[PDB]
Amino acid sequence: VVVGDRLVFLEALEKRVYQATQVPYPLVGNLDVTFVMPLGVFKPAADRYA
């Protein structure tokens, strides 16, 4: 396959290899994020408004 100006391979290795074996595929990554949330903060008198 051609992309940009280069001429590069394109492969999937789930069927030829890794198929019907108890080893997982190593491109299924694991992103990591960390959430935070304030619990009981109380806003000042000026910004309490409908």
Binding site: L13, V17, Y18, V23, P26, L27
Partner: peptide, 13 residues
């Protein structure tokens, strides 16, 4: 053979 084909991806990652 599949061992090498897997080790390549394991080290490239």
């Amino acid at each position: 053979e599949r061992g090498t084909a897997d080790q390549m991806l394991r080290v490239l990652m």
